């Protein structure tokens, strides 16, 4: 039995024609206090997988260590560790999903919601979710926390089903993700302006973008709003 | 002294090889498999005439579709039978079905090598496991203390085994009836037994699909003994 202390908010993601995109802000909240601002919540595993984590940060750092140790362990007595027998997104996910469900079954969960995004060896896109309960699901778009309520509706307008994936380019997909992050900054009280974004493409590989900011915001209309009903001044 | 789980220079486990010598001292047990059923027969061998021979239990039921005969240090077989019975009933509980004869034999043979320095020594008893299932039909297995089991059309174990096995080699064919098999066990038992064969110092049993595993009465076996003697005198 736990209670989360230092927390990370939404993680959002989607598939496009040649790969997957995933994003998450750089904030570590301490309740209502926006305590830590340099927190990286996207963690790459190899050159073909990115694990996005929300929820308790102490448990996130534990998971980082597990993934780091997983890479080390896979390299042992493995001449093809950087080739055929390299870690796949599906391998990394199933490992975490096993751990999360074992921990919930011991009534001592890792208080997280995780999205594993990557590209398999055969070029197929991989995008799957797992949380503190051990619940797993996959979809063309996936998001955690507030992102599930506000980002998914926006991302599903681009990729509403499987057949919309080949029709969606990386330019269009990234635009939607960046737009979603702006909306979350407008409406999520535990969000920050600064965020990280990662693209895993089957051709161009892993592109990790740090220190992004929400921009092109609409605030000007606020000056016209006066009072809460009658007030004219 | 020396370790219990030691290999000889020839590549055999001393204790397993020594347990096989104990089995050669044991009373004879014979099994024959047919398309109409499997027959199991044993030499009781009472050490004294005051001993009530009907209390000598060397043929044993494992389940309705599986039977068992033994030879050697027969006291060692009790825990083997207990395990077999539990394995058979447990499988029925988990899978709502009868357990395969081969799978039962394998379960028993897993105990065999669980000794060392687990129990202190191998079993000093060999088992003939006979049964029927829907897949492989009527079967006869020979389970040793080495952990090895062979399926047999016919098999003899005990003191008169090598002489009886040579006789079974000539007599067995694929079209044997159940009645023919019953007489053949009695015939071969009478040949290798020290004392004269009768209903009190020998016991028959069988397993059929229809009626399951059955140990024969002394009255039923006595008639088969009488039928056997008449047929040999008839030519």
């Amino acid at each position: 039995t736990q209670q989360p202390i230092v927390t990370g908010t939404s993680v959002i993601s989607m598939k496009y024609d040649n790969g997957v995109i995933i994003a998450a802000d750089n904030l570590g909240s301490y309740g209502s206090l926006l305590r830590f601002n340099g927190v990286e919540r996207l963690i790459p595993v190899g050159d073909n997988t990115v694990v996005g984590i929300s929820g308790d940060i102490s448990d996130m750092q534990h998971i980082e260590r597990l993934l780091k140790d997983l890479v080390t362990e896979n390299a042992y007595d493995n001449p093809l560790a950087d080739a055929e027998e390299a870690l796949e997104p599906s391998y990394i996910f199933e490992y975490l999903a096993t751990v999360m469900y074992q921990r919930r079954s011991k009534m001592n969960p890792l208080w997280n919601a995780i999205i594993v995004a990557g590209v398999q060896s055969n070029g197929d896109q991989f995008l799957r979710y797992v949380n503190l309960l051990g619940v797993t699901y996959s979809s063309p778009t996936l998001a955690t926390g507030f992102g599930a309520h506000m980002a998914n509706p926006l991302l599903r307008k681009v990729v509403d089903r499987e057949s919309d994936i080949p029709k969606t380019t990386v330019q269009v997909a990234e635009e939607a993700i960046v737009n979603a992050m702006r909306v979350l900054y407008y409406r999520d009280a535990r969000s920050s302006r600064n965020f990280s974004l990662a693209i895993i493409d089957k051709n161009t590989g892993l592109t990790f973008k740090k220190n992004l900011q929400v921009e092109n915001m609409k605030w000007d209309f606020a000056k016209d709003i006066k009072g809460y009903g009658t007030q004219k001044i | 002294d020396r370790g219990v789980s030691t290999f000889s220079p020839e590549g055999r486990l001393f204790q397993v090889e020594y347990s096989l010598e104990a089995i050669k001292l044991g009373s004879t047990a014979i099994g024959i498999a047919t398309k109409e059923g499997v027959v199991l027969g044993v030499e009781k061998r009472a050490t004294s005439p005051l001993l009530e021979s009907d209390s000598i239990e060397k043929i044993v039921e494992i389940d309705r579709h599986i039977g068992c005969a033994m030879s050697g240090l027969t006291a060692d077989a009790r825990s083997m039978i207990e395990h077999a019975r539990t394995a058979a009933v447990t499988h029925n509980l988990y899978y709502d079905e009868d357990i395969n004869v081969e799978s039962l034999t394998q379960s028993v043979c897993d105990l065999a090598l669980r000794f060392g320095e687990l129990m202190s020594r191998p079993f000093g008893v060999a088992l003939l496991i006979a049964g029927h299932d829907a897949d492989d039909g009527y079967q006869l297995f020979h389970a040793e203390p080495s952990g090895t089991f062979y399926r047999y059309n016919a098999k003899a174990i005990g003191s008169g085994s090598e002489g009886a096995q040579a006789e079974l080699l000539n007599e067995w064919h694929s079209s044997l009836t159940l009645k023919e098999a019953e007489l053949l066990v009695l015939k071969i038992l009478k040949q290798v037994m020290e004392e004269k064969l009768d209903e009190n110092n020998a016991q028959l049993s069988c397993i059929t699909k229809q009626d399951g595993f059955k140990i024969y009465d002394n009255e039923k076996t006595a008639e088969l003994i009488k039928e056997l003697k008449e047929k040999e005198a008839a030519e």
């Binding site: - | 204790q15 347990s19 240090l73 202190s120 020594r121 079993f123």
Partner: protein, 240 residues
């Protein structure tokens, strides 16, 4: 824990520790069991090199396992107490779960199983004890007499003897006991048991113990004078 495999096979296929446990039984005082038509009698030798004994308090050779079953033995006395205790506990445990007292066969099978367990368990030696277990099954009038030995084998006997000079008394019983017609009464069964011990014992004074068991938990031990009457009667008939 002490793990050593003490009971092991030899090149010729023998377990010497089990066979040496039989030698301990052969050293022990003679014990005999004879079952009649409606009873079983357990006879026991007591060596007479021990005078100044207190027979009130000295452990008796025949032990009650339950109200309907008894157990005598030959071999190491200390070892026998362990088997008797275990048997008594199992007797009460059977009544508790099955709501019925043990059969003589079941009790024998249990004791024999304990003896066997000590022949292939690490860190232990076999029991230097052979037992004669006798009694009557619940609501049954057929007499039961079983024997066990260190190896763990057990079997039923019309009549049997164990211990020192047991081969002599077994020789006696083999010609004197008729299967077709066992001792019809209690007196006949006791007499045959006393006769068989008189082939081996020495004197019929405070050397022979007799215990008679009858159906429905009817067990009684004979006194010196009662046994002495059988001894006096047999000797007078012998001089002929």
């Amino acid at each position: 824990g002490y793990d050593r495999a003490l009971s092991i096979f030899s090149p010729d296929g023998h377990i010497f520790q089990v066979e040496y446990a039989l030698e301990a039984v052969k050293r022990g005082t003679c014990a005999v069991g004879v079952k009649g038509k409606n009873c079983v009698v357990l006879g026991c030798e007591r060596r007479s090199t021990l005078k100044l004994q207190d027979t009130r308090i000295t452990p008796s050779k025949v032990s009650k396992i339950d109200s309907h079953v008894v157990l005598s033995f030959s071999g190491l006395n200390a070892d026998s107490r362990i088997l008797i205790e275990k048997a008594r506990v199992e007797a009460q445990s059977h009544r508790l779960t099955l709501e019925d007292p043990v059969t003589v066969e079941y009790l024998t099978r249990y004791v024999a199983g304990v003896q066997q367990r000590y022949t292939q368990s690490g860190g232990v030696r076999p029991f230097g004890v052979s037992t004669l277990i006798a009694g009557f099954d619940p609501r049954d009038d057929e007499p039961k007499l079983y024997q066990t030995e260190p190896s763990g084998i057990y079997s039923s006997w019309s009549a049997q003897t164990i211990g020192r000079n047991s081969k002599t008394v077994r020789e006696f019983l083999e010609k004197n006991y008729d299967r077709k017609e066992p001792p019809a009464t209690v007196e006949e069964c006791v007499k045959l048991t006393v006769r068989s011990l008189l082939e081996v014992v020495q004197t019929g004074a405070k050397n022979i113990e007799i215990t008679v068991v009858k159906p429905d938990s009817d067990i009684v031990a004979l006194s010196s004078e009662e046994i002495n009457q059988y001894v006096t009667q047999i000797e007078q008939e012998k001089q002929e």
